[PDB]
Design a protein around this ligand. Structure first.
Ligand SMILES: *[C@@H]1O[C@H](CO)[C@@H](O[C@@H]2O[C@H](CO)[C@@H](O[C@@H]3O[C@H](CO)[C@@H](O)[C@H](O)[C@@H]3O)[C@H](O)[C@H]2NC(C)=O)[C@H](O)[C@H]1NC(C)=O
Ligand SMILES: *[C@@H]1O[C@H](CO)[C@@H](O[C@@H]2O[C@H](CO)[C@@H](O[C@@H]3O[C@H](CO)[C@@H](O)[C@H](O)[C@@H]3O)[C@H](O)[C@H]2NC(C)=O)[C@H](O)[C@H]1NC(C)=O
Ligand SMILES: *[C@@H]1O[C@H](CO)[C@@H](O[C@@H]2O[C@H](CO)[C@@H](O[C@@H]3O[C@H](CO)[C@@H](O)[C@H](O)[C@@H]3O)[C@H](O)[C@H]2NC(C)=O)[C@H](O)[C@H]1NC(C)=O
Ligand SMILES: *[C@@H]1O[C@H](CO[C@@H]2O[C@@H](C)[C@@H](O)[C@@H](O)[C@@H]2O)[C@@H](O[C@@H]2O[C@H](CO)[C@@H](O)[C@H](O)[C@H]2NC(C)=O)[C@H](O)[C@H]1NC(C)=O
Ligand SMILES: *[C@@H]1O[C@H](CO[C@@H]2O[C@@H](C)[C@@H](O)[C@@H](O)[C@@H]2O)[C@@H](O[C@@H]2O[C@H](CO)[C@@H](O)[C@H](O)[C@H]2NC(C)=O)[C@H](O)[C@H]1NC(C)=O
Ligand SMILES: *[C@@H]1O[C@H](CO[C@@H]2O[C@@H](C)[C@@H](O)[C@@H](O)[C@@H]2O)[C@@H](O[C@@H]2O[C@H](CO)[C@@H](O)[C@H](O)[C@H]2NC(C)=O)[C@H](O)[C@H]1NC(C)=O
Ligand SMILES: *[C@@H]1O[C@H](CO)[C@@H](O[C@@H]2O[C@H](CO)[C@@H](O)[C@H](O)[C@H]2NC(C)=O)[C@H](O)[C@H]1NC(C)=O
Ligand SMILES: *[C@@H]1O[C@H](CO)[C@@H](O)[C@H](O)[C@H]1NC(C)=O
Ligand SMILES: *[C@@H]1O[C@H](CO)[C@@H](O)[C@H](O)[C@H]1NC(C)=O
Ligand SMILES: *[C@@H]1O[C@H](CO)[C@@H](O)[C@H](O)[C@H]1NC(C)=O
Ligand SMILES: *[C@@H]1O[C@H](CO)[C@@H](O)[C@H](O)[C@H]1NC(C)=O
Ligand SMILES: *[C@@H]1O[C@H](CO)[C@@H](O)[C@H](O)[C@H]1NC(C)=O
Ligand SMILES: *[C@@H]1O[C@H](CO)[C@@H](O)[C@H](O)[C@H]1NC(C)=O
Lengths: 439, 129, 129, 129, 439, 439
């Protein structure tokens, strides 16, 4: 009766959820190269009036995409460097005692061994220092820890892994939508959507227990989880103020280069210059014991105004789980965080010792090991704690006192909080509608 | 202003069709040596081209070519959406509309293809006459 | 029914042109790691696109664009095939026809290109008038 | 004779547009094994396709499709080139002309896009009437 | 006079012969991955009325395409596994005698040797069993057979090469045409052509002399050859009924894992549990001596109603030529087929012993060798003999008695019979014809 | 007032300078394969009437493109061949004295050493001859020269690097423009431009000091430089007549193949058959001392009619700088060119001894070395000297006598003179112009 006909339109502003490959883009570092295409210096962020969309940070393929690419890049940049297979020999070791402080006793070992020279038919006696974490006893015979499980390679002493903020950008035909609501918590509709060409800069920082160098929420400390109720799930906490942490490795180190083949050099840790001290991190007591008060108030929102909130130490397991894995300056620290989670909250300078390790299983895989060459001199790091990874045990439904503990994580979780506001969609420009025109 | 019309009504949004159309088509040794990232960049570029061309081929087949708006001779079925024009062009977005039509997409496309085949045969015969 | 008209006469086969046209344009880590099979899949896809576009460019140049059937102003040479219409459109397939014409393909294409260049100049001058 | 008209005047060069257009679109195990030269040949081919398509999309948007010469309704601004026609079509090449216009290229393209959007809306409304 | 004009048509159903790359597609196996793209569960097979085309199975590039890809995939899946270079040492060997049956005497050797441990500076004494085919005498000193010619690697003990039916599918712009006539024999016109998206499933089975697990002809046993007359060419015979063959390796095997480096494991054959017996295959006598009768009748069609047909044993050459190469369960068998070809035909349970080999030159190339890890327990295989590869010598033009022998082949020949009915063509949608219209 | 409108044209013959990837194309050699796509046998060279363009040979990316690709191809063709790491052992060496001419005394050394056999646990005593340039003293103990710096591999004794003329061809959308003026000298406008599909054939010849086997100018000897005035820059001289040079390595060599692993063969130089003589090159005195006269006349054009021109010997530095690096027959020669540049010019058979080296650092990089297997029999080379690479020192502004010396170069310079006439541009087919038409 209406006599309407199908009219075809092309260029219709309609889109559907999609999963594609984002291409990277920055502004001797590995991310200096794998993010060359410069971002626009003035990204074209477009506010969309009257657009509401559903977001889900726990099902975000951008998180998965970053994870795959960080690992893939990592193992490509180290591909051409010298293998340390020849170092997997029987070592003769003793304790380092020369000016070692009492707190470090037995931590370092002085090992001598028979290793080849550049000529196939000649050997040399060399020695180097190792941290005890990487040396396994076989009266003085020791083995490197990776020898019964994996191949060990030397990280290229030229390749930098200092985090670089990187941006993800959409390919043609795609767009990245950003959630700009306030107090968005993981999932559900976000009645404030803006379209961008690229994400903000995100640093590919790797850590456990404490989240470092991210965005500081916006208004208030926020608690997010896939489930909350199910204690098997993690709770991510994002701070609205940084807690500054100062970490150091005080020993003044030197290096020696040992030929292990024709054009193949091994970097060994030499004698420590001066007094030998323990690595550690400083957290301001008066900032931490205030920042947690904000976390506690937000937890009561879900756990009860009259409940008891307790922060306990970490649980059992290996260093990668029970300690704070901290990568800084090029060295790997394993810090003891028990001094940060020791309190009971009711309704009404902190020093963390650290260990240093050189043989690192960078990703939880079997068959590879990375040797981190030592850094000359001393190192000091300054960083922003921007959040927590917490787990929960009990209370709630039984008898008060929910216990929260710092936990480990899946790597992804450290990026999940920054990729949090973004979703990838594809544009579908064709569509039809009834009109009054006929050819 | 690429998706700026997203919250606009279907009628108002008809004025930005070139804004969306122009954005649907568009290092050195790093990607060439890292022959594991190049063969992502090539895949991304090839796909964008293929998607663009599939849309252009459908428009061509339906008799709509080189235009953003085309009238066709296929009548609208009230059974695909029993709404009047004042419910569609005003107070409704294109995103909402797609949800209303979705299931009938293939019916409509098939009808558009058939209409053009008949139109082309008639043109050839009329010109010969 | 992609090649269903293959045994049909040339005339009858003119009704399936969209059947053939729609089929001329169209894992994860396995092909990405096996960077010796990916760079076959990309080659296959790139070639399909290039072949499609070469045909579209010729149609565009000849003045036939967005259509499956186009009349042109180039006269038929009886020397290319001295047959009447009842020998061509009926009782003959397109496959047989291609064999009959083959050698004159380039002559015809060259003539179509020249015709369009003259037609476009005339349009520009007529509009200015 | 691909660039044969390069020294011709702008007017005379209008007769070779198909000469230039036809040349803008177009081993085994060696390149497949030497997966460091293949992913140059694919890049070269993909780029040629993308460049071709970007030009075709602009022509389509401006309302000029399937033609080498199109009149448009955007008036010429004497401020883009205050020359008369006998200075442009005669005694000047296209290469020289591009230097004369260069800075105003984006203004002209934006105007052509706007003109077509208005023309298409008018066609839809006129047909409904 | 007719006043006709050129009319341009696009979408014309015309095609030309072409050679392109087909992409694979199935429904820890290597073909689980290199054939992911699923086929349509209901392939769109279209019968073409009144279409006759010329086919040629001897010039079919689909056969060549499969061959290149089977080899290419094979050497990629085994690329990351451990090399066995360190095993190429002087071995001290003796005979295995503990409960060995008389028929197996001297077949197995017990070899001990000095091989390194995970540490560069330590050695271990280990021993393993080898089949005599892979051990070469240098009074008890032996070498592995590949040491003077090629590098040896261990097949990955996780990668499966069990044949998977795979399908080939056409890329856009191409189609695969199938010959559906009856009694089509290699070459010439096939007045029954159907168009398909993909081929039927073909299993990438590798064998010599006997063709296994293919399609069982259709109506009658068929004999096909490139030439027939020229005895230099092979004759392929396709059966219209399977002959069931049951093969086994009865020895109950065990395995031991030997460290040969850091994260590098070698799989050795350990002691045999229980009685040691000879590997063998069973062919039903009453099926074979009937199936050949059909083959003989078809041969008389080309060789004479009153001639004499004789089936003789294989000729000289290495195992890959003179025996039936059979790959089953992951182990490589070399079976003696003389018991199958011992008869004279005129107009009017069979046990095949087998040998087992572990160092396999999988393709006829120089410089590589594959070590097949042993399978624990015992294996039994059931398969369908679907055809023969035969050669001919004499008779015909001289003095009766054509002799037929099982022969070897080019690998391709085992796929040639399944890819037999398919041809690849490209579509050329543009064409012109005279009409009465003018613009 | 004119009432003109914008008219859009597509297919406009306009272009802009551009840098893209050229694809190669020829007519067991590496360039037999990396230049398969055949050129058109009759290239479509189109003269452009009234076209003048600016060319610059010193900024030509085609030169850079060739350089990158020659190196890239070089290191790919040698990728799969055997490493000679096991040869880096302590050598016991003495002098070769048996029938050695006096001029060659001490040039060759007879070295014996302990190298492994195909079995990991066995050794063999072998010996081979080396040229003294590749052997470094550690009373008789010697090391191969690359052992303290780089990995050494054996050039594949099957791969040919004989120069093949190759052509560069433009990709779709691009064209190569050729400068066809006469007496064009490096930079500036060239009022004679022709369009080509591909370049002429250019042989990828590598040399120092003397330019071999190129194009012989056209009318007169030409001198080209980036600057001329700045003596820090090189001067390239292109001859209008060849000077024929005959080079040889007279010693009749043999070879022996030594197993160094399973399937791994090393090619050693065996005893010299007959008398041992010095390698050398012949330049005709009466051609050279005439060809330089032309060079001198052209130099006076820029340096003064009444100045003094002196040709002096090369300066200090290593062989790759101070000698004529000549690659011929597959062997590497280092020839002494002092006999060619020893004269003072005012207004009014030459024998060059050569050394042979086997361990070659083919490109100026650190960490790789190539071993060139010896050639059996003797070799003789005939080539065309087509030009010079000269440097200048003083005179001009101080007190007469400009001194010219043969110099080294950047590799690129040997191709720079052939890629000299070509420029790459891209076509931009869209444009607009005012007309009198309206839709
Ligand atoms: C390197 O330094 C560490 C740290 O001092 C040395 O570890 C020491 O090892 C001895 C023997 O294993 C431990 O003594 C034993 O303690 C148990 C405790 O009940 C006692 O029952 C035994 O009778 C004996 O005293 C000693 O405590 C331990 N040191 C510490 C702080 O625990 C290590 O041996 C040194 N390695 C060397 C010198 O190679
Ligand atoms: C492992 O078992 C095999 C199988 O028994 C042993 O082979 C045997 O080797 C001996 C000596 O080479 C053969 O004996 C000789 O036979 C010839 C035949 O004419 C005769 O002239 C000689 O005087 C002598 O008797 C013996 O026949 C052969 N066995 C068989 C079945 O052929 C092999 O030596 C055993 N290896 C060991 C114990 O290391
Ligand atoms: C291989 O042949 C070369 C060439 O003859 C041998 O070199 C010779 O080495 C000796 C000792 O180093 C040189 O003699 C010394 O010369 C200086 C010159 O002032 C003199 O002061 C010393 O008292 C002594 O005479 C000898 O000149 C040198 N030959 C030449 C031509 O320079 C080389 O030693 C031979 N290597 C062997 C046999 O291993
Ligand atoms: C081991 O320590 C001694 C003592 O150093 C003191 O204690 C240290 C913990 C730190 O506080 C230093 O600054 C203190 O001076 C070192 O010997 C001293 O070396 C300085 C160097 O100039 C010298 O002036 C002092 O007189 C020295 N004192 C003595 C008793 O010798 C000693 O060198 C250190 N050993 C090593 C290996 O570094
Ligand atoms: C070697 O064989 C003996 C005998 O086994 C018998 O003969 C075999 C061929 C087979 O037919 C077996 O089933 C027969 O029993 C093995 O010794 C026997 O082991 C079984 C195990 O329970 C035992 O009951 C018998 O009494 C044993 N007989 C004797 C004489 O000891 C023997 O273990 C076999 N050796 C190996 C290494 O397996
Ligand atoms: C070393 O040289 C002798 C002498 O050869 C002569 O001088 C040479 C430089 C060259 O000119 C040869 O042609 C000369 O004959 C070689 O001994 C001669 O070998 C030939 C071979 O038939 C023989 O006829 C001569 O009589 C031989 N003369 C003598 C004195 O023995 C000798 O073989 C050469 N050594 C080597 C290792 O080649
Ligand atoms: C194959 O050939 C047969 C005849 O040779 C075609 O069948 C004819 O189709 C016309 C269509 O109207 C009928 O009028 C005739 O009576 C049919 N003939 C017979 C004998 O039945 C058939 O259509 C051809 N196939 C194709 C694809 O054209
Ligand atoms: C090196 O080998 C010799 C061989 O006897 C041994 O004595 C020495 O202790 C070894 N050195 C080390 C540090 O292992
Ligand atoms: C870190 O060092 C800075 C240096 O001035 C200091 O101000 C800050 O308080 C330190 N942080 C902590 C946690 O002590
Ligand atoms: C291992 O080496 C020792 C060294 O003397 C030798 O005696 C022994 O027989 C060797 N063992 C084997 C099995 O080769
Ligand atoms: C193979 O084993 C099955 C098991 O039942 C048997 O029926 C069949 O006859 C056997 N085949 C032969 C050839 O004996
Ligand atoms: C090989 O090794 C033995 C071991 O004593 C030594 O005597 C001999 O001189 C070595 N040979 C060479 C040529 O180095
Ligand atoms: C090179 O050898 C040829 C051989 O006939 C000779 O004619 C020519 O003069 C020689 N060249 C020189 C520079 O002597």
């Amino acid at each position: 009766a209406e006599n309407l006909w199908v009219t075809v339109y092309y260029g219709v502003p309609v889109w559907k959820d999609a999963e594609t490959t984002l291409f990277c883009a920055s502004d001797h570092n590995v991310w200096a190269t794998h993010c060359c295409v410069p971002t626009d210096p003035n990204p074209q962020e477009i506010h969309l009036e009257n657009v509401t969309e559903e977001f889900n940070m726990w099902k975000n393929n951008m998180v998965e995409q970053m994870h795959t690419d960080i690992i893939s890049l990592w193992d490509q940049s180290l591909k051409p460097c010298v293998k340390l297979t020849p170092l997997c020999v029987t070592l003769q070791c003793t304790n380092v005692t020369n000016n070692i402080t009492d707190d470090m006793r037995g931590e370092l070992k002085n090992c001598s061994f028979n290793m080849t020279t550049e000529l196939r038919d000649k050997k040399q006696k060399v020695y180097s220092l190792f941290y005890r974490l990487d040396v396994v006893q076989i009266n003085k015979e020791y083995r490197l820890i990776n020898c019964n499980t994996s191949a060990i390679t030397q990280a290229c002493p030229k390749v930098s892994f200092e985090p670089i903020p990187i941006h993800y950008c959409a390919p043609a035909g795609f767009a990245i939508l950003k959630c700009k609501d306030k107090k968005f918590n993981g999932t559900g509709p976000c009645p404030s959507v803006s379209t961008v060409q690229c994400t903000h800069g995100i640093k590919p920082v790797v850590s456990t227990q404490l989240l470092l160098n991210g965005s500081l929420a916006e208004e208030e400390v926020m608690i997010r989880s896939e489930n909350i109720t199910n204690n098997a799930k993690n709770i991510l906490v994002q701070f609205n103020t940084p807690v500054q942490i100062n970490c150091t490795r005080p020993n003044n180190n030197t290096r020696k280069s040992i030929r292990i083949g024709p054009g193949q050099w091994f970097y060994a840790t030499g004698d420590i210059i001066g007094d030998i001290r323990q690595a550690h991190c400083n957290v301001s007591k008066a900032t931490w014991n205030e920042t947690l008060g904000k976390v506690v108030k937000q937890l009561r929102k879900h756990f009860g105004n009259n409940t008891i909130i307790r922060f306990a130490n970490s649980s059992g397991g290996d260093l990668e789980v029970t300690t704070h894995s901290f990568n800084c300056g090029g060295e790997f620290f394993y810090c003891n965080t028990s001094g940060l989670f020791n309190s009971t909250w009711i309704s009404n300078s902190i020093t963390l010792p650290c260990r240093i390790k050189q043989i690192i299983n960078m990703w939880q895989r079997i068959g590879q090991a990375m040797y981190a060459p030592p850094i000359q001199g001393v190192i000091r790091c300054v960083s922003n704690i921007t959040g927590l990874i917490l787990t929960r045990d009990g209370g709630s439904t039984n008898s008060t006192t929910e216990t929260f503990r710092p936990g480990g994580g899946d790597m992804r979780d450290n990026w999940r909080s920054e990729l949090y506001k973004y979703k990838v969609v594809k544009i579908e420009p064709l569509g039809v509608a009834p009109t009054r025109c006929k050819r | 202003g690429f998706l700026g019309a997203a919250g606009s009504t279907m009628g108002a949004a008809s004025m930005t069709l070139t804004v969306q159309a122009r954005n649907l088509l568009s290092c050195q040794q790093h990607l060439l040596k890292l022959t594991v990232w190049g063969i992502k960049q090539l895949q991304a570029r090839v796909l964008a081209v293929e998607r663009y061309l599939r849309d252009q081929q459908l428009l061509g087949i339906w008799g709509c070519s080189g235009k953003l708006i085309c009238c066709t001779n296929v009548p609208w079925n009230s059974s695909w959406s029993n709404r009047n024009l004042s419910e569609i062009w005003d107070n409704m977005t294109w995103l909402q509309w797609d949800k209303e039509i979705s299931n009938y997409t293939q019916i409509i496309y098939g009808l558009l293809e058939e209409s053009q085949n008949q139109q082309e045969k008639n043109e050839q015969d009329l010109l010969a006459l």
